[PDB]
Amino acid sequence: LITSLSGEKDRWGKGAQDISDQKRKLVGNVSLSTAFISYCGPFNAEYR
Numbered sequence: 589l590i591t592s593l594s595g596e597k598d599r600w601g602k603g604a605q606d607i608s609d610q611k612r613k614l615v616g617n618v619s620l621s622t623a624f625i626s627y628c629g630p631f632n633a634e635y636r
Contacts, residue, residue, distance in 0.1 A: 607614055628636055
């Protein structure tokens with residue numbers, strides 16, 4: 589099974605490592621999302 593779980597172990601390691609090592613960058617992403625939500629309601633497609 590160990591080679592059958594190649595993609596599986598790869599996802600298990602790298603997804604956590606990406607969301608983790610970028611966890612402050614993901615905090616930034618949360619900030620960008622909540623800003624775009626709360627403030628950018630009334631705007632047209634060029635500005636949105």
